[PDB]
């Protein structure tokens, strides 16, 4: 990766979700949650599908909102639902990037 960059934003997502916890949590936590998605600029990949793009993009996105907030935020297992939604949303945010980037 030549660097991470922020491509395009999303916009309050508010997709279907699987369970209303994921929706409500995203909407109250919207302020802590991301407003956009970041991008792995490969200079020579040529062998990634959307499953590899979404994971590699995800794998950055997650750290940006798990390891960074580790500075001093003691959830104590409160992070379970935080990660539950944040996993789901980052995957969906990643799919949307392909669908505005096209």
Does domain 1-102 fall under CATH 1.10.790.10? My reply is yes
Q: Six-digit token pair at 92? A: 């969906």
Q: Six-digit token pair at 68? A: 């960074």
Cβ atoms of 22 and 88 closer than 8 Å: yes
Cβ atoms of 26 and 13 closer than 8 Å: yes
End-to-end CA distance of the chain: 21
Domain boundaries, the chain: 1-102
Cβ atoms of 94 and 52 closer than 8 Å: no
* φ, ψ for residue 75, nearest 5 deg: -70, -40
If DSSP codes are grouped into helix, strand and coil, which group holds residue 41? Answer: strand
* φ, ψ for residue 41, nearest 5 deg: -80, 105
User: Residue 38 and residue 32: Cα distance in Å, rounded?
Assistant: 16
Q: Six-digit token pair at 26? A: 């995203």
User: Residue 6 and residue 38: Cα distance in Å, rounded?
Assistant: 4
Between the alpha carbon of residue 25 and those of residues 1, 20, 53, 90, the distances in Å are 32, 8, 26, 14
């Amino acid at each position: 990766i030549g660097g991470y960059m922020l491509g395009n934003a999303v916009g309050r997502m508010s997709y279907q979700f699987n369970n209303p916890m994921e929706s409500r949590y995203y909407n109250d936590y919207y302020n802590q949650m991301p407003n956009r998605v970041y991008r792995p600029m490969y200079r020579g990949e040529e062998y990634v599908s959307e499953d590899r793009f979404v994971r590699d993009c995800y794998n950055m996105s997650v750290t940006e909102y798990i390891i960074k907030p580790a500075e001093g935020k003691n959830n104590s297992e409160l992070n379970q639902l935080d990660t539950t939604v944040k996993s789901q949303i980052i995957r969906e945010m990643c799919i949307t990037e392909y669908r505005r980037g096209s």
